[PDB]
């Protein structure tokens, strides 16, 4: 089952349940029915999730789905690991006609990112990395996704905030 | 961990519990009481495993132990990930008077299997990397086992209904 | 752990519920309210644990912490992974505050250690790495702990029933 | 590093000096006169190569570089090292201007492709994961790279004449 | 290297000849009478190294060994691969008899660093944790060094010309 | 080409060109025609070589291939590393009813192995490990192989003085 918390300061540190670690082809999903974790599918192309790819605990992003979190890690963790993120990006995109953001968060337990806390303050190769990775790994699915950017942590925050209240 | 069901559609696709994933020379097996993971034991000899090993769910073998099932894997998955495997094929082999049959299955999931339906889908070499594998990485272990062959997808299933009827 | 004998033989043959799988820098740790996986930290510098670090279930030490006990493996396990494990040795440190002992353990199932059972048969270079490690981790992060040194398989094998009753 | 020749037999079996390990994000070219690796640059964005990449001995092609080789490997093999390949079929795609073909070989040494002979072999997802990669890959870098399609052995053999006859 | 352009424009594109990369525990050198891999020791602790470490070609460092650089890469290379660096600091200590020092890089076709030209733009954390690294890697091996601190780009690309032209 | 020697003392170390990493399926071979790193097969079998497998400079093994060598690493090198050698064992085979011996040596610059001399000093299900593996590794390739045994380390130095000057 799950019952877990979004995370201690909220909107400052959030809780990451983690379903894909940094470098996988593969991608996981955490099973609602069960609560363990299934190969939803194995990526078309020769991508590699370029960050820990997972959900923050009790968020209702619309309808369904939990708030997807990409946490940067400079090792991955593994499936099912929790992790207390601080936020400090929205990237923003829309996939079947609507919003599908994300959040773009940090270790808190890393050094290496103790002076992130913007998207202004991750180098913008990556951002665009992150962006391109979205835009073009389903498309041999069928799929192509519309990007519009990025937005800072408050929106980061602002977004999480309401997906808790509304869940 | 077995309060899951057998997979979807049973017959021509199941669910398959991971144990351990390709590559790896750590045995590891799904604990009876706790269901967490639990380590079998350190292989004897330099053998990986060349396929994701598991256990199909709610499922009893002739022996007394799970169904247990083979899912072809470009990139190996953690142990304990739940798999929608495509049964093509049925390994034969019989451990210590035990008949120790395994399904041969692959992803649902993953188009480059997308004409994998049958064993005659599967290079020969494989196929055959995979019975000598069984036939010794226990050999050291004092265990000698016999190989026998195998049979189509329309078998491995057949096996699959018998496995899920001898749980109850 | 929530629940799970300590161990089939006690003395000898002991229960390792590892945590952090070796060559991890990624220090994790288990959650009782959960269960599940959580990160506790990233080792502040380059180093990589030696060994699968974990801990004996149903057990108690002097500081409130479970029983911390380090398993030696070749290839790791994985978090959450049972080890039929086999103490050999203990290790007697002190993180500045309580001293924080831990088990030096050996896995059976693996032939390869069929004959270690003291810390004497251990090639002592390791031994030392093992020590270094902790001397030595913390520390960038502004904390020191005081390594004394090794005590035997039966020394080891004391402080264990001890915890595993102390409840 | 260019002593070698393009090969056993040259049509039907050639030799492919790799320069990039299936799975990796780093691209390394083999350079010019050192011979020795070279570090020429890190994706843009998380793609890994599908393929250990590499060039033919002694060959030139239109644009004015060796003419490069796809072999298909399980377990990918180390920069450098020389590999036996049998062609099975012709990458087509126009990289800004240049028509930038590229082989498509099998290992002769692993069994598992015994019976890989020809682009009709191939899964068509492999196949397509690999001209969606490049398809790609350098987007993010500026250039845009428009793909054509695929041919078979023969082509990618008549191909390997040609290039190794650019070589003079 | 027997004989190679120290870098394409110097100061800055300077030619980094990587021997141990990132991740690595066994330390390897380069040997000039074959121009071989040779393996020279392991480290004795659970230690892996933070960055390719590598050598800038015709040069000369007033030990007589060539010049130490250190490429940050996320993705390590392989030893006697030849990365178009960039120089962004020194790391100054001394092994205890002569100074040795290191020169902090950053690969160039590599977007991720593409604003990285002092240790200023280094996070610190891992600044520190290189620091330590070297503060503590020999130590076991009954040997000790003096870890000062860093010095900026300007002031490694100084102790650069010198030792490129010195010969 | 290649011009390397056989190694320092010599019988009591000895170098080691390694071929074949600790891990690979994939058996590579040194050309002698190049010097270059060249794919033997990849192994019909899911065995991984359990050491790093080479050959040793400059030695005449009757007819031809040059003496091979087994070194235990905890770590593979890299295809094409130098390594500093003591041999500690012989072990003894017949494939196409020939001796087909090969040297077991262990790492010169790693502590773990300094008490390690002589096979006695090494594990048994190691050695059993390292001989199931030639016994069937090339089983599927048609070929079946008669395992005597194993010799200390005189044979080993004994085997490798002769080769050298049979060279």
Same mark, same amino acid.
């Given at each position: 089952?799950?019952?877990? @918390?979004?995370?201690?300061?909220?909107?400052?540190? &959030?809780?990451?349940? +983690?379903?894909?670690?940094?470098?996988?082809?593969?991608?996981? @999903? $955490?099973?609602?029915? =069960?609560?363990?974790?299934?190969?939803?599918?194995? $990526?078309?192309?020769?991508?590699?999730?370029?960050?820990?790819?997972?959900?923050?605990?009790? =968020? %209702?992003?619309?309808?369904?789905?939990?708030? !997807? +979190?990409? &946490?940067?890690?400079?090792?991955?963790?593994?499936?099912? =690991?929790?992790?207390?993120?601080?936020? +400090?990006?929205?990237?923003?995109?829309?996939?079947?006609?609507?919003?599908?953001?994300? &959040? $773009? *968060?940090?270790?808190?337990?890393?050094?290496?990112?103790? !002076? %992130?806390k913007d998207i202004? #303050?991750?180098?913008?190769? /990556?951002? #665009?990395? +992150? *962006?391109? /990775? /979205?835009?073009?790994?389903?498309?041999?699915?069928?799929? @192509?996704?519309?990007? @519009?950017? %990025?937005?800072?942590?408050? *929106? *980061?925050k602002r977004e999480?905030?309401?997906?808790?209240?509304?869940?």
């Open positions: 089952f799950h019952d877990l @918390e979004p995370g201690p300061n909220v909107p400052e540190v &959030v809780y990451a349940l +983690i379903e894909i670690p940094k470098g996988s082809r593969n991608k996981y @999903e $955490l099973d609602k029915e =069960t609560g363990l974790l299934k190969l939803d599918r194995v $990526l078309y192309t020769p991508f590699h999730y370029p960050v820990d790819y997972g959900i923050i605990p009790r =968020t %209702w992003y619309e309808d369904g789905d939990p708030f !997807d +979190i990409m &946490v940067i890690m400079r090792e991955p963790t593994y499936p099912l =690991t929790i992790i207390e993120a601080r936020p +400090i990006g929205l990237f923003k995109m829309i996939d079947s006609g609507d919003k599908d953001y994300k &959040v $773009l *968060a940090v270790p808190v337990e890393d050094p290496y990112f103790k !002076d %992130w202004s #303050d991750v180098p913008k190769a /990556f951002l #665009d990395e +992150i *962006a391109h /990775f /979205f835009k073009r790994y389903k498309e041999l699915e069928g799929k @192509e996704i519309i990007v @519009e950017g %990025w937005e800072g942590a408050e *929106a *980061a999480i905030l309401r997906a808790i209240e509304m869940y």
